[PDB]
Amino acid sequence: MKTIIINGVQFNTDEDTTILKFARDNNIDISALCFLNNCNNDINKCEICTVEVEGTGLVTACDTLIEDGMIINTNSDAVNEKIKSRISQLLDIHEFKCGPCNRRENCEFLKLVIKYKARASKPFLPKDKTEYVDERSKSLTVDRTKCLLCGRCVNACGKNTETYAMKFLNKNGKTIIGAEDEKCFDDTNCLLCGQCIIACPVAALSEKSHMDRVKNALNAPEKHVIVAMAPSVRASIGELFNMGFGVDVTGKIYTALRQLGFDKIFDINFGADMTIMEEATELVQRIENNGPFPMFTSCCPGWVRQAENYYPELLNNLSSAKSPQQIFGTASKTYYPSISGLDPKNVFTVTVMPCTSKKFEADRPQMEKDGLRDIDAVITTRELAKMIKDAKIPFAKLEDSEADPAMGEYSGAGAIFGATGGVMEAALRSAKDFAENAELEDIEYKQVRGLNGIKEAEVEINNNKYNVAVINGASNLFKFMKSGMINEKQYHFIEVMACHGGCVNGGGQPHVNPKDLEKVDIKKVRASVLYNQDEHLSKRKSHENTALVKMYQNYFGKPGEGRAHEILHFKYK
């Protein structure tokens, strides 16, 4: 038993924990900055978590263990001046202009500046930001006028992907962060997954903006601008409107998009059901053809880049079905004109994604046909939130509306795509019906759900056993391959998501304050919205989507052949 005194209050505990963790468990106020994902910035600790231990002096609470007999003061004059001096030194390298800043509303640094009334010794006012900004990437951007050199992005890249694509660099004899050799991120092994963005406490790292494309398209009188949102968006964007976590705001989004002036309100979950139609058909074909095995999902751009950069020998095993975004986009320029009369060249297709890598995918040169892009613009959940706020739309008080059904209806199988294992479960629901020529009532595959890094299961399809795996995070793909687990069984179907937890934890998602991250399981609570929708939807199999079956019946024909094969597929070499 340890007896500790903190600000003159005695505590008795048996835990082996840091001062910071004990304080947070006991409603004691200690600030922190560089401590994230259980690590601080080892090569320059920010020391914002400074506390006083009588008899020892100032220590960093984030990595100092509590000991019996400790007497801790967290708010003494010496502690305060220490922290305020460190924030002051950060202001000296920080362009403090929150007005036009894209983190103005939820910035960790602004909060600390206000809390400690910190003041620069010399305001940082660069006149040429071109040497500080890197906008070369199709997915990520760097603004080093905001960078605190807290190392959170470098540590989060290593933890989440194990690529170490985000590095410390020496530019002109001083320290920056960036890609290898300061190249454009796209030209390195970087996955463009944006987990570095999610870890950034300020506006230093951001998504590559597509707001110019959307604004210009909405302003062009001849353009018919369609919009369709990813599964994860309806489970997360409410966080940026003070609505809390785990709120289903699907109907509010549809209304907001209409008020923004979009001409048609569809949904990427419709494209998810399309992807299942092609991919589940493909899986049954590989079963009939005895291979090739395994088939990998191909809907995650971060995983595709991981395969391209690290495992190119696996590219031919990726499912040929386009991702829900790109398969939706292809149909928006072909099927949708056939039921509307629109000139296909005048259709402008915008998606809202919880993902930065989707911008790279939509901009791939071959993701077009007859000169028409599958997808013309991709905006993140964060981008849509700012678009709604800039238009002064009272999102939290909007009435519910519905999507336009022709490419907007979706089944419960498409609805769960945004969670790790969702693509697997959705695919199996259709694959089993396809292969057994039956309509099975049992459709729930809970063995592939949850936040385990690697999830494996044996499934029975048409009186034979098959091995499936769900890889939850790019770092677990490396583990799955390097450990030899890939060879320990004959796998037949493998889902890979680059982001831990699936797209609900994507790099385009709302930032979450580090304290909130310790109090709520963001990955689980966001995903629970999607599984809740699947539970209450009248159609829970992709091939039972009534608007989808009308589209295949009246336009595309049979999945995996004929017209669907020419147009809805994509292979990587």
**Strand residue runs (E) in 224-373:** 224-229, 264-267, 295-296, 347-353, 368-369, 372-373
Tell which one of 35, 109, 241, 466 touches ligand FES (CB under 6 A). Answer: 35
Tell which one of 6, 107, 272, 277 touches ligand 402 (CB under 6 A). Answer: 272
Tell which one of 23, 53, 62, 70 touches ligand FES (CB under 6 A). Answer: 62
Tell which one of 325, 330, 475, 476 touches ligand 402 (CB under 6 A). Answer: 325
Tell which one of 158, 178, 418, 421 touches ligand 402 (CB under 6 A). Answer: 418
Distance in Å, CB of 318 to ligand 402, minimum:
13
Distance CA 86, CA 79 (A): 11
Distance CA 472, CA 13 (A): 36
Report if residue 232 touches ligand 402, rule: CB under 6 A: yes
Report if residue 423 touches ligand 402, rule: CB under 6 A: yes
Is 39 annotated as ligand-binding?
Answer: no
Cβ atoms of 66 and 18 within 8 Å: the answer is yes
Q: How many residues sit close enough to ligand FES to count as binding (CB under 6 A)?
A: 12
Report if residue 314 touches ligand 402, rule: CB under 6 A: no
Tell which one of 102, 323, 476, 545 touches ligand 402 (CB under 6 A). Answer: 323
Distance CA 20, CA 12 (A): 16
Give me the residues paired with residue 217 across strands. Answer: none
Distance CA 364, CA 373 (A): 9
Q: Which two tokens stand for residue 43?
A: 């090569």
Q: Which two tokens stand for residue 110?
A: 């602004």
Q: Which strand ranges, in their side-by-side order, compose the sheet holding 224-229?
A: 264-267, 224-229, 347-353, 377-380
Distance in Å, CB of 266 to ligand 402, minimum:
12
Distance in Å, CB of 451 to ligand FES, minimum:
26
How big is the CA angle at 509 (ends 37 and 86), to the nearest 5 degrees? 45
Q: Which stretch binds ligand 402 (CB under 6 A): 38-46, 208-216, 416-424, 541-549?
A: 416-424
CA-to-CA separations, 318 to 13, 363, 369, 450, in angstroms, rounded = 53, 20, 21, 23
Distance CA 494, CA 311 (A): 15
Report if residue 506 touches ligand 402, rule: CB under 6 A: yes
103 CB contacts (<8 Å, ≥6 apart)?
110, 202, 203, 511
Cβ atoms of 418 and 527 within 8 Å: the answer is yes
Nearer to ligand FES, 70 or 240 (CB): 70
Is 49 annotated as ligand-binding?
Answer: yes
Tell which one of 4, 33, 272, 295 touches ligand FES (CB under 6 A). Answer: 33
Handedness of CA 474, 476, 479, 480 (dihedral sign): negative
Report if residue 48 touches ligand FES, rule: CB under 6 A: yes
Distance in Å, CB of 365 to ligand 402, minimum:
18
Report if residue 355 touches ligand 402, rule: CB under 6 A: yes
Is 184 annotated as ligand-binding?
Answer: no
CA-closest candidate to residue 431, choices 481, 466, 456: 466
Is 46 annotated as ligand-binding?
Answer: yes
Report if residue 45 touches ligand FES, rule: CB under 6 A: yes
Nearer to ligand FES, 112 or 378 (CB): 112
Distance CA 372, CA 88 (A): 51
Is 299 annotated as ligand-binding?
Answer: no
Report if residue 49 touches ligand FES, rule: CB under 6 A: yes
Q: How many residues sit close enough to ligand SF4 to count as binding (CB under 6 A)?
A: 54
Nearer to ligand FES, 64 or 106 (CB): 64
If contact means CB under 5 to 8 A according to the sort of partner, which of ligand SF4, ligand FES, ligand 402, none does residue 419 touch?
none
Cβ atoms of 440 and 433 within 8 Å: the answer is yes
Torsion of CA 299, 305, 306, 311, to 10 degrees: 100
Nearer to ligand 402, 177 or 471 (CB): 471
State which of positions 491-520 bind ligand SF4 (CB under 6 A): 497-499, 502-503, 506
Tell which one of 21, 103, 138, 210 touches ligand SF4 (CB under 6 A). Answer: 103
CA-to-CA separations, 26 to 10, 23, 50, 61, 565, in angstroms, rounded = 12, 5, 17, 14, 59
Report if residue 154 touches ligand FES, rule: CB under 6 A: no
Nearer to ligand 402, 36 or 451 (CB): 451
Report if residue 300 touches ligand SF4, rule: CB under 6 A: yes
C-alpha 13: how far from its chain's center? Answer: 38
CA-closest candidate to residue 453, choices 431, 436, 437, 476: 476
Distance in Å, CB of 46 to ligand FES, minimum:
4
Distance in Å, CB of 68 to ligand 402, minimum:
49
State which of positions 175-234 bind ligand SF4 (CB under 6 A): 177, 185, 190-196, 199-205
The total of other beta-carbon atoms located within 10 Å of residue 490's CB is: 10
If contact means CB under 5 to 8 A according to the sort of partner, which of ligand SF4, ligand FES, ligand 402, none does residue 32 touch?
ligand FES
Nearer to ligand SF4, 238 or 302 (CB): 302
Q: Which stretch binds ligand 402 (CB under 6 A): 246-254, 318-326, 387-395, 559-567?
A: 318-326
Distance CA 491, CA 485 (A): 10
CA-closest candidate to residue 319, choices 285, 288, 365: 285
Q: Pattern of binders to ligand FES over 3-32, x per CB under 6 A?
A: -----------------------------x
**Strand residue runs (E) in 8-67:** 9-13, 50-53, 57-60
**Strand residue runs (E) in 71-112:** 71-73
C-alpha distance across the termini of the chain, in Å = 62
Annotated binding-site residues for [2Fe-2S] cluster read: 34, 46, 49, 62
Task: Enumerate binding residues for ligand FES (CB under 6 A).
Answer: 32-35, 40, 45-49, 60, 62
Task: Enumerate binding residues for ligand SF4 (CB under 6 A).
Answer: 94, 96-98, 101, 103-104, 107, 109-110, 140, 146-153, 157, 160-161, 163, 165-166, 177, 185, 190-196, 199-205, 300-302, 354-355, 357-358, 497-499, 502-503, 506
Task: Enumerate binding residues for ligand 402 (CB under 6 A).
Answer: 230-232, 268-269, 272, 299-300, 323-325, 353-355, 358, 417-418, 423, 503, 506
